[PDB]
Each structure stands twice: as structure tokens, then as C-alpha cells.
């Protein structure tokens, strides 16, 4: 029978901001999501995967030992040193429990990828924090210490074969700069991100997120950026991006495992995204990805700051993984012109690499 795995560990709530108790990357993000899965009776339908700590050797699959050593050292720091260290990065706060929580987020995901790859479960959801996709090989960034999704892709290959094909779909409203960079020269890991860009004025504020960054060397064509410009986007724009880009490229790539860097900050009500993707929209995207890799899909929480929006959106993704009927959504709504421009720009930049793509 198809089983859905779920991993959650309340110890990941220990990572906190001691200088701003209302910082948006709240410990309550994961507990509210977990409680909503209980209320909707989704949790009881899942196989509970145990959380674990990632080892330093596993962190070294993507990160430098210098970076690992510095984050590890924060476990023993006084508040004044935690404040100073956090200030060395772009948008990071650290507590003595941060390192442990980042290890738990990655270890939880490794156990989930292992459960899927060994056939213990068909697919899985990881309700983890702190997030990972902005973390680079050598630095923490944007609430992220280690790149959980990137590490999970490498971990998956370490327990199978180096050439295991992993698709990472990053639907967090922000560009996963760390994920792109880690796999930029790699043809074994296809990275597809959709993200608010605003001509480089939206976090992480780099032209690296533009559609013309297609990958390097043997990785040329294996990096797909779908940047949004022109304000609020929603379900029609995301469905069109999946229809014309994400799914044709994914099918041509033929992944053996699908990781979703599932931020829910493109959700309706999120003040850090300003977008309108609905829980039914996220459900549709999850169900489309389930048609890939024999259903081998692991959904990894990234960002998403409206407690109610993320709890509803992520629960709807789990509902899809469990085999519930997908929402009836169509492609009849006209897109905002700027979203058409964005999709056409990606189609043009990726036409050389992916024969199945349409011109416009
Ligand atoms: C890091 C983050 C979201 C992360 C996330 O959700 N990861 O996916 C949001 C922060 C508040 C932000 O908006 C910001 C904007 C500009 C900036 N500069 C120009 C230095 C620094 C930070
Ligand atoms: K993204
Ligand atoms: K790549
Ligand atoms: Zn985000």
C-alpha cells in the first residue's frame, strides 16, 4: 500500500531569537503546522519517521568544515557573542540551540529520504526549522545555517549512487541561492526555483536569481530560475509555470527522487512574500510532482511566516501525498502580462537544453 512518512521533532523549536521574540522565523511555525496535521487527522494517517541529528561528516557533503565549526561553536556562546556572530551574516539570529536544531532539520530529512529510497514509505513531509535554501557551502544566510535540501540530495546519492537523479523544486517565494550554487556545475541535480525577483530588488537581492542563470559546465541547462516581476502572483501564474516549464523539464530529466524546498511564503496572507498562492494551489503543485520519480517526493519546509496560512498550505500538501483527491484547478485564467513575460523568458533561455519545451 502507498504510505506517507512524516517527520517532526519539537526540539527544533529551541532555535529562537533572544532579541526579538516576534521575529517572523518563529519556533511556533513548526508546532502550529504539526497541530493542524493532528486537527485534520492527517498525522494519524502517516508513518512517523524518527528525527535524528545530521553528523558533521554528512554536513560536509555540502558545507566547508570552517562554516560547520563556526556554527557548532555558537552552542557554547554567551548572548553578546551570539549577537556579534549573527551580525556577521545577512539576516541571521543565533541562540545556543541553533546548531542542534539545524542538525535535527537535516538529520530528519536524511531519515525521510532514506525511508523513501529503501521503500519504507512512498513519499514524506518534513516539518523542520530553521530553513536551509539560502545557506551556502561556506556561510549562513537568510535564517538558514545549513542547506537541508541540498544536503538531502547529496545524502540520497551517498546511500544509492553518485548519479542518482534528484530534482529539487523550490517553491518558497525567495530564490534558494545556496541550492543553485551548490549544484550549479552538476547535471545529477536539477534545480528549479520559482521566486519573486523584482529585477533583483527582492531578497536575496542578486541577479543570480534571473532566468538567464541556466547552470555552468556539465550543469548547463540544469538550473531553472522562474523569476517573477510586477507584484502579486497567485495560482494561475504558478499553474502556468508548472504546465509550461517545471513539468516538461522534470519529465525530460526523469528524476529518481523529488525534493521540494517547500516554503509557504508565496501563500495568501504572508507579509514576507506578498503573493496569493492558495492551499488548493499548493495541493495542485504537490499532486503534479507526485507523477514524477514513481511518486518519490519529500516535501521540506523552508520559509512561510503566516502561522495559519502555512499550517493550512502544508496540511494540503500532506493530504495530496496521502492520496486524497486533488483540487479541481484549470488553466483558464489569463495571467498577469509580467508573468507571461517571465515564463516566455525562461522558455527562451531553456529551449536549447530541453527539446520538449514550446517556443512561447
Ligand atoms: C531573510 C528573509 C526571508 C527569508 C526567507 O523566507 N527565506 O526563504 C527576509 C528579510 C526580512 C528581508 O526581506 C530582507 C530584505 C533585504 C535585505 N537587505 C537589502 C540586506 C535583507 C533582508
Ligand atoms: K524559490
Ligand atoms: K544543477
Ligand atoms: Zn522564503
Instruction: Say which ligand is closest to the CA of 204.
Output: 1
Would you mind telling me the total number of residues written for the chain in this entry?
360
Atom 2 of ligand 1: nearest residue by CA position: 142
CA distance 94 to 82: 6
Ligand 1, atom nearest to 265 Cα: 6
**DSSP 8-class letter at 219:** G
| Domain span including residue 79 | 1-360
Nearest alpha carbon to residue 233 among 117, 78, 343, 74: 343
239 neighbors 245 (Cβ within 8 angstroms): no
CA distance 337 to 121: 41
CA distance 94 to 318: 30
Going by C-beta distance under 8 Å and a sequence separation of 6 or more, which residues neighbour residue 37? 6, 43, 46, 127, 314, 315, 318
91 lines ligand 1 (CB under 6 A): yes
Instruction: Say which ligand is closest to the CA of 171.
Output: 2
C-alpha cell at 215: 547552470
143 lines ligand 1 (CB under 6 A): yes
Q: Is 244 a catalytic residue?
A: no
- The domain tally of the chain equals 1
Q: What is the CATH number of the domain that holds 213?
A: 3.40.800.20
CA distance 215 to 349: 11
Q: What angle do CA 127, 130, 133 make, to 5 degrees?
A: 95
Please identify which of the residues 133, 134, 181, 287 carries the catalytic annotation: 134
**Given ligand 1 and candidates 87, 130, 195, 203, which is best to mutate, with the most ligand atoms within 8 Å of its CB?**
203
Cis peptide upstream of residue 6 (ω within 30 degrees of 0): no
CA distance 150 to 310: 22
Quoted resolution (Å) = 1.6
Nearest alpha carbon to residue 262 among 291, 236, 285, 237: 285
Dihedral pair phi/psi, residue 63, rounded to 5°: -110, 155
CA of 203 to the centre of ligand 1 (A): 5
Nearest alpha carbon to residue 168 among 62, 271, 260, 305: 260
Torsion of CA 342, 343, 345, 346, to 10 degrees: 120
227 neighbors 197 (Cβ within 8 angstroms): yes
Report every protein residue that has its C-beta within 5 angstroms of ion ligand 4. 172, 174, 263, 265, 303
**Given ligand 1 and candidates 86, 91, 198, which is best to mutate, with the most ligand atoms within 8 Å of its CB?**
91
CA distance 37 to 33: 6
Torsion of CA 128, 130, 134, 135, to 10 degrees: -110
CA of 195 to the centre of ligand 2 (A): 4
CA of 1 to the centre of ligand 2 (A): 32
CA 251 from chain centre, in angstroms, equals 20
Amino acid at each position: 500500500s502507498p504510505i506517507t512518512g512524516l517527520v517532526y521533532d519539537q526540539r527544533m523549536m529551541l532555535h529562537h531569537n533572544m532579541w526579538d521574540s516576534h521575529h517572523p522565523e518563529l519556533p511556533q511555525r513548526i508546532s502550529r503546522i504539526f497541530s493542524r496535521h493532528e486537527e485534520l487527522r492527517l498525522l494519524s494517517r502517516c508513518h512517523r519517521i524518527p528525527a535524528r541529528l545530521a553528523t558533521e561528516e554528512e554536513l560536509a557533503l555540502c558545507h566547508s568544515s570552517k562554516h560547520i565549526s563556526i556554527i557548532k561553536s555558537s552552542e557554547h556562546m554567551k548572548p553578546r557573542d551570539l549577537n556579534r556572530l549573527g551580525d556577521e551574516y545577512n539576516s541571521i539570529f543565533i541562540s545556543n540551540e541553533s546548531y542542534t536544531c539545524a542538525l535535527l532539520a537535516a538529520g530528519s530529512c536524511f531519515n525521510s529520504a532514506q525511508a523513501i529510497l529503501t521503500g519504507q514509505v512512498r513519499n514524506a513531509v518534513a516539518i523542520v526549522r530553521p530553513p536551509g535554501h539560502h545557506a551556502e557551502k561556506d556561510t549562513a544566510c537568510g535564517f538558514c545555517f545549513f542547506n537541508t535540501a541540498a544536503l538531502t540530495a547529496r545524502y540520497a546519492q551517498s546511500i544509492t549512487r553518485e548519479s542518482l537523479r534528484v530534482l529539487i523544486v523550490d517553491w518558497d517565494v525567495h530564490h534558494g541561492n545556496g541550492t543553485q550554487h551548490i549544484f550549479e556545475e552538476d547535471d545529477s541535480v536539477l534545480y528549479i526555483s520559482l521566486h519573486r525577483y523584482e529585477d533583483g530588488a527582492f531578497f536575496p537581492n542578486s541577479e543570480d536569481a534571473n532566468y538567464d542563470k541556466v547552470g555552468l559546465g556539465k550543469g548547463r541547462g540544469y538550473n531553472v530560475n522562474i523569476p517573477w516581476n510586477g507584484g502579486k502572483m497567485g495560482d494561475p501564474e504558478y499553474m502556468a509555470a508548472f504546465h509550461h516549464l517545471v513539468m516538461p523539464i522534470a519529465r525530460e530529466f526523469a528524476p529518481e527522487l523529488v525534493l521540494v524546498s517547500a516554503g509557504f511564503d508565496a501563500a495568501r496572507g504572508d507579509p514576507l512574500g506578498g503573493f496569493q498562492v492558495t492551499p488548493e494551489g499548493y495541493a495542485h503543485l504537490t499532486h503534479q510532482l507526485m507523477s514524477l520519480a514513481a511518486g518519490r517526493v519529500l516535501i521540506i519546509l523552508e520559509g512561510g511566516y503566516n502561522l495559519t496560512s502555512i499550517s493550512e498550505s502544508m496540511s494540503m500538501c500532506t493530504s495530496m501525498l496521502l492520496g486524497d483527491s486533488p483540487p479541481s484547478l484549470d488553466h483558464l485564467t489569463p495571467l498577469k502580462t509580467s508573468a507571461t513575460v517571465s515564463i516566455n523568458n525562461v522558455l527562451r533561455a531553456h529551449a536549447p537544453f530541453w527539446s520538449s519545451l514550446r517556443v512561447n
